From a paper:
Fluorescent proteins share a common structure composed of an eleven-stranded β-barrel containing a chromophore that is spontaneously formed through cyclization of a tri-peptide sequence following the central α-helix. Insertion of a few glycine residues between Asn144 and Tyr145 enhanced the pressure dependency of the fluorescent intensity of [name]. To summarize, though further investigation of the mechanism underlying the amino acid insertions remain to be investigated, we found that glycine insertions causes the new static water interaction to the chromophore, which can enhance the sensitivity of fluorescent protein to the hydrostatic pressure.
The [name] mutants were named [name]-nG, where n is the number of the inserted amino acids (1, G; 3, GGG; 6, GGSGGT; 9, GGSGGTGGS; and 12, GGSGGTGGSGGT). Glycine, which has no side chain, caused a 1 nm spectral blue-shift in emission and decreased the fluorescence intensity. To confirm that the glycine insertion produced a space near the chromophore, we determined the crystal structures of [name]-1G and [name]-3G at 1.3 Å and 1.5 Å resolution, respectively. In the [name]-1G structure, β-strand 7 is slightly distorted, causing a small expansion of the barrel (cyan). The glycine insertion shifts β-strand 7 along the chain to the N-terminal direction for [name]-3G and the C-terminal direction for [name]-1G. The most remarkable difference is that the side chain of Tyr145 (Tyr146 for [name]-G1 and Tyr148 for [name]-G3) moved away from the neighborhood of the chromophore, producing a large space near the chromophore. The space is filled by water molecules in both [name]-1G and [name]-3G structures (arrow heads). While [name] did not show the pressure dependency in fluorescent intensity below 50 MPa (red), the single glycine insertion made [name] sensitive to the pressure (blue), and the further glycine insertion enhanced its pressure dependency (green). At the higher pressure, the intensity of [name] decreased with increased pressure, while that of [name]-3G increased and that of [name]-1G was biphasic.
Numbering used by the authors: 1 to 64, 68 to 231
Amino acid sequence: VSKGEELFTGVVPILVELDGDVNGHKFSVSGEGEGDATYGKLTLKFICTTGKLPVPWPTLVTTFLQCFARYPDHMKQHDFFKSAMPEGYVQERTIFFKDDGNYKTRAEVKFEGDTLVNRIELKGIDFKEDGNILGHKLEYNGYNSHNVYIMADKQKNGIKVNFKIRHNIEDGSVQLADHYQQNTPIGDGPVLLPDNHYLSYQSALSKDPNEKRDHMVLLEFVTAAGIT
């Protein structure tokens, strides 16, 4: 196994800490769980520690650990995420909500000992007061996409990722969220610059029946594909 790959052969504990500000509405979220890349499995629970989350949990699903994706053996050489570990990488995204505002996120993903940690800062601007986001008009469910596109970015020694999410609006319509992403390694060591490929997602949202705080239980299965 590769140096980076070896860090993911078993169950890895995860910690996520996010500070956000959407149209001046400030909030913080703490998350805990575990990743089992062998099965492309993520099991997580996020808690808003500042009170009520000012945006719908579904809009934060993509922000809330691609290093846990299951890369088929024949595609191992295209797994940028694990190759950058343990020093990690910085993930940046601009998420454009159609006919509404946008989120810009900066996440530092790396190991703190044997724990995979993600420190995230989220900034949202230009949102409409009674739009689907600030007006909480989105159904509490996930989105499953087979089109999370990955390609190399030799200029930052990393990758570029793009994909679309369609959140379900309570009236039966959909709220599009266009994602543009870039990942840059934190260390100066070699990383695997991948050939074009994609990740396939299965995402499910739920609630902890005994939890009184505003929270989200998230289960995902992530698999790389596209290179035969």
